[PDB]
Design a protein around this ligand. Sequence first.
Ligand SMILES: Nc1ncnc2c1ncn2[C@@H]1O[C@H](COP(=O)(O)OP(=O)(O)O)[C@@H](O)[C@H]1O
Ligand SMILES: Nc1ncnc2c1ncn2[C@@H]1O[C@H](COP(=O)(O)OP(=O)(O)O)[C@@H](O)[C@H]1O
Ligand SMILES: [Mg+2]
Ligand SMILES: [Mg+2]
Lengths: 276, 276
Amino acid sequence: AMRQCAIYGKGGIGKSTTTQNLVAALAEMGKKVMIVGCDPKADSTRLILHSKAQNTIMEMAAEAGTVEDLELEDVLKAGYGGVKCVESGGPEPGVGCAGRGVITAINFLEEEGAYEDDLDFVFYDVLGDVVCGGFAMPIRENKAQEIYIVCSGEMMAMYAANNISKGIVKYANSGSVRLGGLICNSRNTDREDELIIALANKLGTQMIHFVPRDNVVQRAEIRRMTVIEYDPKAKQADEYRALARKVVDNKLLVIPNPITMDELEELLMEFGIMEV
Amino acid sequence: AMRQCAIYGKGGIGKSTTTQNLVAALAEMGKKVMIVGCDPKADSTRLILHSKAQNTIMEMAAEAGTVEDLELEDVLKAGYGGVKCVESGGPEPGVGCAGRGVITAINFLEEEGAYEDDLDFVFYDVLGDVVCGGFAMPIRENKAQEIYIVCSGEMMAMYAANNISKGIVKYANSGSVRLGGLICNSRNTDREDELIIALANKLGTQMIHFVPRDNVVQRAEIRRMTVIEYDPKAKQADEYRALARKVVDNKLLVIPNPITMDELEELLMEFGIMEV
Ligand SMILES: Nc1ncnc2c1ncn2[C@@H]1O[C@H](COP(=O)(O)OP(=O)(O)O)[C@@H](O)[C@H]1O
Ligand SMILES: Nc1ncnc2c1ncn2[C@@H]1O[C@H](COP(=O)(O)OP(=O)(O)O)[C@@H](O)[C@H]1O
Ligand SMILES: [Mg+2]
Ligand SMILES: [Mg+2]
């Protein structure tokens, strides 16, 4: 068995930092993991690979001829902890649909046998500012059973979490895509943990972990590493280990209850975030 | 003559707050302005209209029958300073293309004569996390000659500015869409102004204004107002007036020079943002 998980959230919220650190913690526990980058920024694997980024399936297919000319063994790259990594890529700005590469990539990985019996987890790192095209495909086509949304007390981050939740609801009549939890990536604001716990309760899920804001992240990433690899003794490394443990142990996977903008604003006013 | 301008940038960066406050300052100077909301969040006009939000063209067309059944006089709403306001709307998450409503809305406004001779400015407030579909339409179809990008010293905000710039370059062989400037919406970080000035120089544009982070914005928005209306004496009101003056006077409209991720990272390292 393998658990197929997707990490969604608005741009810049911390999806790739959280995913790569979570996955490094899973590998440190002995889990076999693959990360599939589903964001055109295409830097979702660089901290596992010690790299600038990773060449994308779209780029590699263009050089080979067609995507079918690619060999899976040439595409997947392994880094820290044996974690396997791939990037979808996407068309250049202004050309096409920004999510088109996600569809090509996931289909290629499935056709070519990337989902090997020995994997314990797959994590898709997915752009979440719009829920359409290839960015909706992991939900629409039942590719990621467990969605975890990275968010914060920022209104826009909570709005994105609600929109992703609406996407999960839309496709709930078939497949098994569910909301597994919210991950609060802290902005160092008062009562932010309580705010995200309250949002999670309204949606029917949970806040699986509160990730502190810690500059060790910047120090590790300047060196192209997860915190897990850069400083295994860091307080923040233990935070990512706690998140990983709770993901492993999580059994709550729900069809969420999206909320109104009125409810979102009331959450913000209640926890005094806008008055901090 | 009227100047057609678009405000792009990543989600949550400050597009709608900056646009509505800039436009309120323009109205306070005597300019006639229309705001066209081109973000599915559909709250781009609420501070002009003193409102929760505004019903969208997509919603109104659905109730009327077709978009052609709508009357422009029923759709446009005027608020503070006589500023005229409309929202495009968009399909629900997981359904269709998130930008489809932008195309319908702009075409409707053009067909129905919204671009009246007496307007001095039109501002499109456009989602910028992806540059495709209806979000690319103001660039691809030559609707906004002057693009202003709201950004900050955040890596993701600068990446978005670069992607929007790539979109402008892609369509430069026809039409007249140009980059007019970067607006830095401050994160209260050291040397952020210098960083955005340097990014602008690399792109070939300018940093037209540095907007400070000021909690008066939250106090005004809780009351559904621009700072311009809520407290005309506020320091931040004068900031938006300075931005408005410089937009009025701006003559630099360029085909930008997009940069590499290497150059973006070097800008970040140089100005010590990641080490603050
Ligand atoms: N917990 C944290 N503490 C400090 N910095 C963080 C943390 N999480 C993310 N960051 C920083 O925030 C920025 C954006 O994170 P990233 O994971 O790239 O966002 P996304 O993938 O959602 O666009 C990066 O510079 C990253 O180092
Ligand atoms: N200069 C500023 N000072 C303080 N708060 C700001 C400022 N600019 C924007 N904000 C706040 O940031 C949040 C996001 O701004 P908004 O304009 O809605 O972003 P976008 O339209 O780009 O998604 C809002 O809560 C807004 O009040
Ligand atoms: Mg990322
Ligand atoms: Mg907005």
